[PDB]
A paper describes a structure:
Conserved residues map to the cap-membrane interface. They include two catalytic histidines that function to effect unimolecular transacylation. The reaction involves acyl transfer from the sn-2 position of the glyceryl moiety to the amino group on the N-terminal cysteine of the substrate via an 8-membered ring intermediate.
His85Ala and His85Arg were crystallised in the presence of the FP2 substrate and structures of both mutant forms were obtained. However, while density that could possibly be identified with the substrate was observed with the two mutants, it was not reliably fit with the lipopeptide as model. Our conclusion therefore is that the density observed in the substrate-binding pocket of these two constructs corresponds to structured monoolein molecules. In the His85Ala and His85Arg mutant structures obtained with crystals grown in the presence of the lipopeptide substrate, a different kink appears in M3 that causes it to curve away from M4. In so doing, it acts as a gate to create an opening between the two helices that leads into the putative active site. The particular ‘open’ conformations captured in the inactive constructs likely reflect the fact that the catalytic residue, His85, has been mutated to non-conservative residues. Indeed, in both mutants aromatics that include Phe149, Phe152, Phe157, His153 and Trp162 have rearranged in a manner that may facilitate opening the M3 gate.
Residue numbers in the entry: -7 to 212
The structure:
Amino acid sequence: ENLYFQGHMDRLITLVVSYSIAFSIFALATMAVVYGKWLYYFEIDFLNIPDLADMTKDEIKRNYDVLITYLSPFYDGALHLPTLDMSTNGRIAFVDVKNILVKIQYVMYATIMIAVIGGIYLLKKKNEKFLLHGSILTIIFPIALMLPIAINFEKSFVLFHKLLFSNDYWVFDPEKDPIILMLPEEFFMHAACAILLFILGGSILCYSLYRYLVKKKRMS
Ligand SMILES: CCCCCCCC/C=C\CCCCCCCC(=O)OC[C@H](O)CO
Ligand SMILES: CCCCCCCC/C=C\CCCCCCCC(=O)OC[C@H](O)CO
Ligand SMILES: CCCCCCCC/C=C\CCCCCCCC(=O)OC[C@H](O)CO
Ligand SMILES: CCCCCCCC/C=C\CCCCCCCC(=O)OC[C@H](O)CO
Ligand SMILES: CCCCCCCC/C=C\CCCCCCCC(=O)OC[C@H](O)CO
Ligand SMILES: CCCCCCCC/C=C\CCCCCCCC(=O)OC[C@H](O)CO
Ligand SMILES: CCCCCCCC/C=C\CCCCCCCC(=O)OC[C@H](O)CO
């Protein structure tokens, strides 16, 4: 009567743990790309942002450095671009973007702890499937968040937008928020591609860890 209860828990724990790694890797990849400077630096020359924005390369890079420094959850000050103006609707939008990254990070630290605490409880029990269930669940998670796009393309992006932001009938107007000119749509598309690229690598390493383990367990 008891080992029927115990098996019902380790399958629940494997679920809670598997989902926790799926999200942990999603967050970790997101933060690697958002706070990463290699990709955007590459896009300055690739997308010819100096001529898009009528700004020098050094201009563009130091404004970007200040923005990424602002988006740290540990920078308590307001956003003060070195050479660019900014509407109050602009400042609001960047507080929205910053709020997500703090929300994501706080949940990430939560899933990281549950994933390894619950993960070692399972490994102490000679059980490895959370490393395999997780591995495939990390591939599935980031785009289950994209699933609404398949149902309706323009309308789904109206809820993604309003889930994030605090002003509905705003604008991208370069005369009032000229940092738009150095943040073209292609940059965000490539960045998201880097986010999943990182997630894909993440799924592999923890699938490798599943196979390295269970092959040394069956060896005995
Ligand atoms: C007690 C309340 C605590 C709050 C948490 C309750 C949430 C549990 C949800 C359903 C129970 C079913 C438990 C086992 C379900 C099977 C898990 C499963 O679907 O396995 C595939 C997945 O990828 C992972 O392995
Ligand atoms: C945890 C904090 C301390 C340690 C971290 C320091 C903070 C990182 C800031 C700048 C370096 C960014 C440069 C590295 C960016 C590499 C990853 C990236 O996102 O760009 C690669 C791109 O995907 C391929 O084209
Ligand atoms: C349980 C799920 C897996 C557990 C994993 C344990 C944590 C591993 C810590 C760092 C690995 C990668 C961290 C990538 C982001 C940290 C660096 C960062 O944010 O700075 C910007 C970055 O340097 C620009 O590339
Ligand atoms: C969506 C997946 C992309 C993956 C993440 C890559 C992007 C993260 C790097 C920088 C974000 C900074 C810009 C984020 C958007 C700022 C909002 C904006 O454009 O400002 C509005 C305007 O100023 C007032 O109307
Ligand atoms: C509910 C919160 C629980 C309390 C919190 C306890 C701390 C989390 C424990 C381990 C994380 C260690 C591995 C994390 C890898 C670091 C990657 C990272 O966090 O980079 C983001 C950074 O802010 C880029 O600017
Ligand atoms: C594919 C998986 C991707 C993972 C995603 C995780 C969520 C990241 C959350 C916030 C990052 C900042 C989001 C900022 C998005 C703004 C994109 C945009 O198009 O900004 C308008 C720009 O002005 C056009 O020219
Ligand atoms: C043992 C119990 C613990 C179980 C834990 C499960 C094992 C997860 C393994 C790998 C996940 C790592 C995924 C990391 C993906 C983020 C991509 C990244 O960090 O990029 C590098 C960064 O840019 C550099 O500067």
